[PDB]
Structures are given as structure tokens and as C-alpha cells.
Symmetry: C3
Subunit: 264 residues, 3 copies
């Protein structure tokens, strides 16, 4: 028996056998091993086996296959690079009384930063009924060390979750630290550090004659320190204006875009 060792064949005690090297190996966990030890590919990270025994790239969060079977950015329904209240939230927030507001917030992770958009809409009355001697509105979000929404927030927990189409995951998320405001950039503190805020002039109902100041706070003064409810990450949105004004108006803001350094 003459073999061509120059092409993957060799001996083992004068017994012919295919000399497999890289990317190749023998399936040890065969029903007939060592007798029947079929040769197969040696895979690792990023690759997996199809139900049909075919090798495929194992895709994770953020990726998916297109039509030609190529890998593209984007997710097949489930999307964990987006944390939100859903694009069209039912009353889900409290400003002065329970469920008096529809709060909209979409956090999209873009690596070291989070791109966000926000909008609020009262659904129980005019400003005068939600403020008192106050000429401001405040919506706050407190998160534990895992990025999980805490009870002492203005937003109801049920529909604050990762994206799933135009809705959210049926199951509550357990970790979103990648969406939290970076603690080195925005430390926890009682002192209002300029860098912790994003301050702009906005307009009630988009009306130029009805200006307001929107102040967004990352950690810092928006952190909860109450006994038993100390938050690690936090973020609040405050709208202020000249006392006496808009008393009869209905609180309704225009969508607002902003971004911040992420914790990880």
C-alpha cells in the first residue's frame, strides 16, 4: 500500500490514518469511539454548528444575518442595545399624582456614549394643578448598582426594559450598567457640578413665547440618599420657568435629544 503523505495521509503502527492538523480534529464523543472516530472541524469562539451540522458564525447582541446569509448590524426583534419606555408609553409616570404623565425616554447605546431622546406629556390637568408654589416639573430615575430601576423613581417599573420590536422584553432586565451615566465623568454628590448637567432653553408646546429651561442631571444631585434607598446611578429631568406663567397650560414638551458618557 503506497500512500501520498504529501496530501494528508500517514501511518500508525503501519495503519493508515488521515493526518489532520489545524481547524481539524477527531470527534471523540462518538457513539462508536474509538472505533468510529469521524474527522471533523475544530472550532472555537465566534463559530458554532448548525442543526444540520454546518458551521456558522455565532452571533450575539447587536448582530444578525441578512438575506444572503451575511452578517449585518441590527437585531432580529430583541434589541439589548436599547433601553426604553417603548415609543408610545401609556400613562407611566408621576409628577404630582400617580399616572398623571406619559414619559418618553429612549436610551440607545453607542459604545462609550448613550444617545437619548426625551418627551413628557401631562394627562390629568394643567400645570397649576401639578405645581403649587413650584414653577417646575421634575421626573427622576434612580438605579441600583446593576442599572435596575429603583422604586423611588417617578417612572413605573413595568415598561422600562430592553427593546423588542416596538415593545419591550416580556421578562424584566437584570443588568443595564452599560446604559448608566459614567461615575467618573458624573460623580455622586450634593454639590451641583456643571459637568453633571445638560442645560438648554426649550419651549412649552413648541411655542417660542413660552420658553422654559430644561436641566438634565446625571448622578450628582439627582442621586437618592434616603435610608434604605441609596442609588448608585441616577438621572433626572427638570423643567423650570418664571413663576406665575402657564398656570392654565397643559405640560407638553417637544422631543429632546442629548448624549452622555456611559459607565461601561
Amino acid at each position: 500500500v503506497s500512500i501520498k503523505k504529501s496530501s494528508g495521509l500517514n501511518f500508525d503502527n503501519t495503519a493508515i490514518a488521515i493526518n489532520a492538523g489545524k481547524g481539524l480534529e477527531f470527534d471523540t464523543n462518538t457513539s462508536e469511539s474509538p472505533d468510529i472516530n469521524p474527522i471533523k472541524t475544530k472550532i472555537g469562539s465566534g463559530i458554532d454548528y448548525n442543526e444540520n451540522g454546518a458551521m456558522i458564525t455565532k452571533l450575539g447582541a447587536g448582530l444578525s444575518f441578512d438575506n444572503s446569509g451575511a452578517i449585518t448590524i441590527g437585531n432580529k426583534n430583541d434589541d439589548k442595545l436599547t433601553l426604553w419606555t417603548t415609543p408610545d408609553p401609556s400613562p407611566n409616570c408621576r409628577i404630582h399624582s400617580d399616572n398623571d404623565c406619559k414619559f418618553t425616554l429612549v436610551l440607545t447605546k453607542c459604545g462609550s456614549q448613550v444617545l437619548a431622546t426625551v418627551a413628557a406629556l401631562a394627562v390629568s390637568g394643567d400645570l397649576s394643578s401639578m405645581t403649587g408654589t413650584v414653577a417646575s416639573v421634575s421626573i427622576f430615575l434612580r438605579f441600583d448598582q446593576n442599572g435596575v430601576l429603583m422604586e423611588n423613581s417617578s417612572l413605573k417599573k413595568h415598561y422600562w426594559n430592553f427593546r423588542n420590536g416596538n415593545s419591550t422584553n416580556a421578562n424584566p432586565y437584570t443588568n443595564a450598567v452599560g446604559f448608566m451615566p459614567n461615575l467618573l465623568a458624573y460623580p455622586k454628590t450634593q454639590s451641583q457640578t456643571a459637568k453633571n448637567n445638560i442645560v438648554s432653553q426649550v419651549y412649552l408646546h413648541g411655542d417660542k413665547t413660552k420658553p422654559m429651561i430644561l436641566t438634565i442631571t446625571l448622578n450628582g444631585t439627582s442621586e437618592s440618599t434616603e435610608t434604605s434607598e441609596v442609588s448608585t446611578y441616577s438621572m433626572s429631568f427638570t423643567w423650570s420657568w418664571e413663576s406665575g406663567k402657564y398656570t392654565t397650560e397643559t405640560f407638553a414638551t417637544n422631543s429632546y435629544t442629548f448624549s452622555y458618557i456611559a459607565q461601561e
Copy 2:
């Protein structure tokens, strides 16, 4: 004829054969088949073969090969994650009269949101010659149910397509739904719902003494309801100021950044 079956080979009808396992198969599509089938690799979604027969990961939109043969994000040339008018557009928009303005708009898909940058430059004359009794400028985009720009838009159709280097795709796109404003978040309506708008104070020619208000509208009020030309998605840009101002000025805005929840 001694075969150590523990190493890939086997005995089929007293004939030495290769016992192929996971990730390996026999090419039954060779000129000389099924009598002579070589051993090829078993591959599925995410994997392909180049001309040299080597295995490579099949990349789609958003991904590309690093000069080190690594998979990285981004397509310097053909890029389906960017719908724009090119960065250096020629007279391509109509404010008052044909081609009287250069309109620059870049929509960059960031998953659940679209990050965008906009700028406009009149190239035919001063504000007076483009408004009339109106102290404002409007640029609107109408899209069919597939995200294709409709005839009833201020922007011309030729150079509004997916990115390719610093220019556009040669072939007109047929779907950009993932770039369209989310209908649940921004419904089509005859009503000025605050959330459908983004409103900020901008400055003409970047001069602090020449303030203007910029109202970007998503769907809703910017939708086209005209018989035969009813849009599904739309966005408009309106710049307004005190009537009787900047009559001899050239309309030139600074670059503005905003983002919005995408349809998908």
C-alpha cells in the same frame, strides 16, 4: 490495508473511505460527481468561500474587513447605515424657486434611533426674494410606505441615497424604512402634538443678534394628505423669525444635530 478508524478513515464495502464529521462534507456538485466527490467544508450562515477556496466570514451592511483580516464596524465606501444628500451637495433643494438652495442632511442609523445633522444655504438670493409676507423658511421630505422620497418634497431625488465614499449609491434605493420616524412615537396627524416636534433657538449666520427658531417636525403635521400624493412618513424643517427682519440677508444656517426614534 490496516486503517486506524480512530483517525477519520473507515471501511465502506471493503473500500477505504473518509468518515466525515461535523463541519465537513463531500462536494456532490463537482464536474465529476457523484462518483468522485472531494472533501469540502460544511458551512452555513455567516461563512463563505473566496476565489482561492479559502473560508471567510460573510459580511453585510455595517461590517467590513480590517487590513489584518479582522471583522470591524464600518464601510468607508458602500454604507447602507447612512442615508444622505452627500456632504457637499450642489443646488438640490427648493425653498421659493427651483434649485435656490443647497440642502445638507445626513441620517445615520443608530439602531432604535437616527442620529442626524442638517444645514441649509440659499444660493439664489436674500431672504426677501424667498418669503413674501412670510417670515419663515420650510423644507419638507415626504416618503412612501417604503421610505422612498416622494415627488412632493423640497429636496431633489437624484442625490438622496445611501452613502458611498463621499457620494451616493449609483442605484436609487428601494427601502429606507429603518430611517423613517417611528409612527407610534410620531403619529400622522392634523394636530400639532408637541412630541412630534423638536424646537430650538438657532442663529442666522451664527450671529447672536440674529436669532431664529427651528422647528423640526416628524410625521404628523408634515405629512402630505393631497390626493394621489399621500405620504406615510415625513419630516420638515421650518426656520422662523420676527417678520420684517433679515430681509437683505442670505439664508445660511449652522449645522444642527438632533435624533429621533426610528420606525424599525
Copy 3:
């Protein structure tokens, strides 16, 4: 000897050999080659070999493996899709005198655009001590043809690098053109082209009563034309307010979000 050609084996002049097809080849580099060449997988771009000899997807910038070993978007210990000064810079910038300011700037690549966040803080005195009939503060970044920070810049070179956790890359970056402002969209010019800037009203210390104008310049008039130090790309941040105001105040800004079209 009989052989089953329909199963990967063939005859080369009476020599039994394995008929290698797509995705396979013979390792002709072994210590025993060119005679005892084992059979191995033919690999190309996107794929690499484990130390264990297994096949794995070769991941580059922007990608990484998660728990289940799947390919996911995101990079912790090395993110070349983020060029920053680190989230918590020590004095690292010069406004009037050396190290008199903590300049924070994060540039995150989002395909065709760079998403950015900026914030500055003086750490040596008040506004009067940094101005003098000025009524403004400027911070400029000049870059060479590779996107490498130049000497005639306000920011110290040391900690302006790609991201690594909450710090920077141990090694100085040699190319970041991908983070530079597009030259076609924002040309180099002694002329103040409206589109080259981004202008907004901000507030000192987030105090509604202490407004300022923030002018960001992409290339254009921010480019250095000095002999021997002629920048290719550049960006500047200029804060101006009404003369005579805020002389005893310390310069502190709120975080500012903005974006621009990238060079590549």
C-alpha cells in the same frame, strides 16, 4: 487496495490520497513538509486559529465575544471607536496659562458621523484672570493629515487617545482620520461658512441668568496656517458673552452634545 472516491479519497498514480476541496488544503509548512503534509482547513479573512489550534472569528474594532462566545457589538478593554481625553481628565488644557483647565471631550464614531460630548472647567482662577477685554474663551484642536493632535493645540497630547476602560490606550495612536470632520462638508477657509459651525446658547453653571453663546468650528477658520504647523483638520470651542459680565465667576460649562460628518 479499493478506495471510495465518492468519499474524499483519490488515486494519484496508485498512491492513496485525500482529495481536498473547498475550505481545505495541506499544511506544507510543518516540520516534516514538503513530504508529510497534514490536512488542514483553508482559512481567509475574518477567521483565525486558536492557540489550541481551533478556528475562531477574527474580531477587530467594535466587536467582541460575550459569555456564550457569540460575536457581539462592544469593546471594554480597548475601544478604537472612541477617541477621548478620558472621562475625568486632570488639568490637561490651556486657556490662558498652562494647565488652567480640565477639558473633557469624547468623540464616538457612529459610522458617517462622530457623536460628541464636551465640557470644560477652569482650575486656577476666575474669568477676569483668563480674559482682559476679551469676554470669551477658546479651546482649539489642530490635527495633521493622519488625525494626530498637533503642538499648536490647547489640549496636552499625553491623554488624548483611544479608549481603554475608563482610561486611554497605553500607546499613542498613529491614525484617527476616521474621527476628523469631513473636508467636503466643512472646508478649510479664512471665510466663516455658516455650515462649518454649530452655534447654541448655553448657561454658565447651568444658571439661566448667566447665558453664553457656544460656537464650535469644524475645520474652516479653526485651521492653523502657521508656517511649519499647518493643520489638515481642526475643531475649536468658543464661548462668548456680553463684555463686562461674569468677571468673578469661575469658568464651568454643562455637558454639550453634538455631532458632525466624519472624514471617513
